[PDB]
Symmetry: C5
Subunit: 353 residues, 5 copies
């Protein structure tokens, strides 16, 4: 029954005592802010610069003793999004940020609801490039935790205290998949605090859990390396008399192992601690290098026989045959038990982390 | 007959009851928005980050009971584009966005038309970087669907409902070609809806269909691999006595197949599910590896004959000749039937998707 | 004799009837805009994303029946560049754009002149990243045409019509050279038109012509490939008895041809139609592959002779010598006539396009 | 007891004599600014463009004779962050900058405190891309110093003088680690000054110390090179009669050393002075090249014996055996004493810098 | 003695006749602007896109007949940097620009001084990405000249004329070094002019001189190539009987020369004119190719002897020995005189440019 313009002008205006630069219920208890997180599109995680791009909606609810009309017959009112510089929006920033621009397509992407009691709604979609300090102890499994710290800036703990919600904590979009990782539906959340030299500031956070969807690294690194140890066993199944071919084969296998190994760490950023992949590459490289060394020893034994050329002649030839046959038998069992030990210790550490 | 300035000042002014912060025909039925899409320049699709750049014009028409002059002798009026903060433009955003800036060259790229009844026009060219979740089950064919979701932000389903148009749905520019794909002239379109925890919001979308213009991947991957299996058949047409040359040829072919294979997946982003190209590379690699293995077996048989050096001698030589000739015959027929089976199953799946 | 401030305040002010939001000589004939283009710095053309960066000055002249003082003793007046929001600048955009920011260093880069009759001047330097749909039928020659479409946005053909100039059409900077291309001094220009669903809009364009300054591609691709066919002729001038060396040489040449070929298309964006360079690479690859095949055939003939080891013995040896000598003679003449045919068909198509 | 709005309006208003465009206690002594630095997230250092990204909080305190209410019962007051254009914030810039944008997420990231005496607080989080002129005399150790120069712009030394703090100088975040370097807890700090042609300006700086967390460069460069000298010693443990194999092995090792060496300097920017890594690569390359040269000399001696083929025959064979055995003994001791000398001179220079 | 606010309000205000939109001493002589350049941080020159990043301070002084208080006892006054839209700053732009943003960290980076006579100061730090058309006739020496053209925009030669200074022309920062180049302390400067179709505009410029600090290109390109010609001389010091090894060595050296050569031009942008480095690579490639050719000729001579196998036999063997020994002697003297001729013509052209 009353004109909409008149109601809007009177409320949050200059003819009333509403001042947008001061905290409501001044000089008393702090105001509680209830935040909810709707993840719109997770993805584009950078593993070389330790960051990821995510756009949240950041809806926050609080109560004020003012702006309580209590005269309209409905429960809540929808206000226009171009009158947000008089609603006293609270302060909120992220402790790990890079850029973090707004969204201004067609019209401003703000929202502002107001009810009879004073519980408001304020959600703004913002694209964040949050930096996460991921620890990469083992590269193939790569269990990871990503955070974000909602924290005030200029309002202490005894001035403004933030809180989470109970009906739903962190919501995700329906049908949201990632090509690198998969999202865990546990959504571990708690909150820390900050102690600077100016006062005690609140800082609420939330943790995510992302594990690697295996199958890429098996074809890029594990499958080619296997085709190299089989190549060295192929060098074991060849005639000893021929010097050119064998030598070339051993050398070529070693070179490929080095190139591959190198190229495997290119995507990864410079790190000091040895990785799981490095251990695998070193073991393979050792096997191929050992094969080459075994050939040099056999060649030397045969050469010694040639230089000294009855019973010792046959003994040397027999020794060369025996070492080659025992190397052909011994090499796949040690590699198979290394493969079994390696995958069983990494599957139990994948279950344990 | 009446002064233009006076008419402009009176309409959408402060001496009248027009308030730009409130929805027209308040507390009643919702207002319908009729949207049209003119694609100006499609292209620059990113296959490694799953996005594409497109600039639409976004013309939207709606009706209001106000701004109905009904006193000028013409049907419609052209207003200046610097008076858009009083025309109550509705809210519209895209659910998949990255950046999405405006266009401000020379003068603002807005448009605003107004007729006697109140049907307005509002088109703004905006460059969008829309993220599309493309599924790459088979890489060479790469059938793809790209979308965009027009959705309100702050107006529920019972407050503002969007709709499409009937005279033309999504228009494209005349003579618009893409180097990677080709545009399908079907333009499949329908609309979903959104259900958040704050209310029911409308969400209108449109789907495109882009198929790969084949001919690039045939020269980059298929043509070189063929020149590798012919190389292994060349190794089959060589004398068995010579150990260096053959060994080197087999090894070299295998190495090229691995390098090529690796480099072929560099453009593609990290994915878990095996691709069609990977299957082709594996089959080729297997053929060349098998050739190498066949040579090792022949070499071993010949060596056995050498170590034991009448009727068994001839039998061993005959066996070596027989295995080489049957391998030279058997290898191109298995590769030819694999090529026929591979291309016929991919052409029937290209017709089926 | 009259105060400058008073004259400025009265003209394009609120005490006069000048309204900046309305077109001059309203409800009558359209106003003609005379545009000139001064290219400041052409360059930075992107061949992988089909675009180029150019900064024009965009001076445009038009006439209005208002702003005709006719009281100062000079012909024209220079106004300050911070009073451009009251001069009714017309609308102009480009149909192919990416970014296209302004220039704001020290002071605004605008210009505004006004004469006694009303012919104004308005030039603004803007850096444009225009997208051009270049067709690359033949890569080395790469004849190209680049455009830019000046078009209004909100003013129809019967409301505002653009035109070019007659004293000079498109000016270039003195001493402007490009490292990739060279500018043609013809400057072909004409104008198209646009027909959308809202009305008939004017669209004026201009075409440039850029041809490749040859000498880069001759050293990067043509010179190394020649040094590969000479390498295969070197393999032809070697003894047939030696199996290792020859085989290795043939294989190595083939591998280099493949690597080179691959790497040559890296700069170029993904395209479907076969290029001129690809044809050259294929022909060279065929020659080297053929050489390898020729060796395998000779080796096989010699091996047959070895297995059967009087008159047929000499005949086989003679045949091996004859095939090698005829291959050594036949191979440079076919390659020389291919080189002559290839360069004469590309020089006549370079003269014809 | 007094209304908050009235107090805010009167203070830093137009009804009082507070002018925000003039320095407090004008025409007298300069005002001292006490700055503190809280490092929020150090990291993303660029070693190829000599820069690093760091976000500081920049809290600065100063005193003014105005804004001394002395009427509220508390010690300090918290003001709103949207009234900062009337508090006369001082001027501060950085002498080495690239970009250096602000932070505007949800609400402005400013802070403003005011006490009864007039000591204010003003902290703003700003992401800085500071350029540091790092000297890379030795690449593996890479001891580095990073700075930042806080300096005024428009206020001379006798007008505004900056100072540091005594209770804490430069604070770091709790649990801040870097993947490339490690932060030194000394935090060396002092201050320089500037003398331009316009006056004497103050310039306060702070220096950091970052040393390389070793373990990356040991696996990427040192470990593969060792596996190359062992490869050349493998070539020393092979029969001299065989010419193909040995030659190939020597050549292959030399080629890998060159490729590796090249690729090792790719990350590093173009520099003129020789690096420590280059010295190591050159020494290794020399050892492998020397091995190859040793083989050529032995081959030549054996060939001479072949061409001349009693007592000199045996003497030549004996000489070939003696040179090979003495090269097999002499080569690992010279490489081991080079390794000992190299690591002991670099560990004493790592302790000395 | 007079209030600072009153003086500031009266001067450059609306109660006086000062108009910021008009040139001082109107309709008379032009105003002279004295510019000085302080280079803060030179560096980050791009050799592939022909540009460089430099931040200047751009202090400019001019005189006006207005703003002459002549009532304060000091010589000059310091004004606040937030009142620059009323001081009539002149127009200045750069003819070669890319981006060229401002600097806004903490407070605006402007400066404004005003004396009793009217000589003002105005310095603004701006980061410029100036495009320079460098000519690369010889790549290792790479003598270069970089410019920047200060020019007005909207004020003709008879309206506003710019000038340089006499006490210092272009100042550099103390201790400013570059990793790629070194700065010449000559600072050649003069000024051109512009003649467009609208009038005569002033354009003042300054030229820098940057020469290459040699030592990078000697290790990346010159040192590896030498280790390739020594490798071909190693192939000359080997036994002719062995066909595999030699052939492989020749081929490998040629391949490395090609790969290296290619990779050397990767950093450089596409250019047509042959470079000095290309000439060096071609000469080296020719020497290694020639060595390979020499071997083929010797092999052919030996083969001819084998096919014909008394006095001609010895003569052929003697000829093979003579050609090998004369090639081993002749090859290092031609390469040494080429090295001497090459470095003496480039050191005299380095002294001449
Ligand atoms: C939400 O705010 C209310 C007041 O605005 C807080 O209630 C006060 O909390 C303190 C600490 O427990 C008590 O000493 C007061 O007596 C409470 N006030 C009243 C009126 O009961 C409340 O703690 C806040 N909620 C949370 C979760 O902290
Ligand atoms: C366009 O808007 C009109 C009203 O503005 C809608 O018409 C109403 O629709 C509801 C639902 O069907 C009916 O119950 C009402 O009776 C309609 N009003 C009238 C006056 O007839 C209409 O539905 C909208 N168009 C679309 C496609 O939804
Ligand atoms: C420039 O504008 C004038 C009017 O502003 C145009 O002149 C009119 O053109 C139409 C079409 O030929 C004629 O029917 C009218 O009679 C013309 N008016 C007058 C007063 O002669 C003119 O065509 C425009 N110039 C161009 C090149 O289109
Ligand atoms: C802080 O500021 C005060 C004044 O605002 C400075 O005190 C003056 O310093 C000069 C130089 O030593 C003396 O000659 C004056 O007598 C001092 N004034 C008074 C009232 O004592 C002080 O130096 C500044 N602090 C620092 C560290 O420079
Ligand atoms: C600086 O400006 C003054 C005037 O503002 C210029 O002086 C005039 O120059 C012209 C050309 O030489 C003479 O014809 C006038 O007579 C000069 N005026 C006076 C009052 O002497 C002066 O040329 C400018 N400086 C420079 C270097 O051009």
């Amino acid at each position: 029954p009353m004109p909409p313009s008149e109601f809007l002008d009177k409320l949050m205006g200059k003819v009333s005592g509403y001042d947008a630069r001061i905290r409501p219920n001044f000089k008393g208890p702090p105001v509680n802010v209830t935040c909810n997180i709707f993840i719109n599109s997770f993805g584009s995680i950078a593993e070389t610069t330790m960051d990821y791009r995510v756009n949240i909606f950041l809806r926050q609810q609080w109560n004020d003793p003012r702006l309580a009309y209590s005269e309209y017959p409905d429960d809540s009112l929808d206000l226009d999004p171009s009158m947000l510089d008089s609603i006293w929006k609270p302060d909120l920033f992220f402790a790990n940020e890079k850029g973090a621009n707004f969204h201004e397509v067609t019209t401003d992407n703000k929202l502002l609801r107001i009810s009879k009691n004073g519980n408001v709604l304020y959600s703004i979609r913002i694209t964040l490039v949050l930096a996460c300090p991921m620890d990469l102890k083992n590269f193939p499994m790569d269990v990871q935790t990503c955070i974000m710290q909602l924290e005030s800036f200029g309002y202490t703990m005894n001035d403004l205290i933030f809180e989470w919600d109970e009906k739903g904590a962190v919501q995700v979009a329906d049908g949201l998949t990632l090509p690198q990782f998969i999202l865990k539906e546990e959504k571990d959340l708690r909150y820390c605090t900050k102690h600077y030299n100016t006062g005690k500031f609140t800082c609420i956070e939330a943790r995510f859990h992302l594990e690697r969807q295996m199958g890429y690294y098996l074809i890029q690194m594990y499958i080619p390396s296997l085709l190299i140890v089989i190549l060295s066993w192929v060098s074991f199944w060849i005639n000893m008399d021929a010097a050119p071919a064998r030598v070339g084969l051993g050398i070529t296998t070693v070179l490929t192992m080095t190139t591959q190994s190198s190229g495997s760490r290119a995507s990864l950023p410079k790190v000091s601690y040895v990785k799981a992949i490095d251990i695998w590459m070193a073991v393979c490289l050792l096997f191929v290098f050992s094969a080459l060394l075994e050939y040099a020893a056999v060649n030397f034994i045969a050469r010694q026989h040639k230089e000294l050329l009855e019973e010792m002649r046959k003994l040397f030839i027999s020794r060369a045959k025996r070492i080659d046959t025992v190397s052909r038998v011994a090499f796949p069992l040690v590699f198979l038990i290394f493969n079994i030990f390696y995958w069983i210790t990494y599957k139990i550490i994948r279950s344990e982390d």
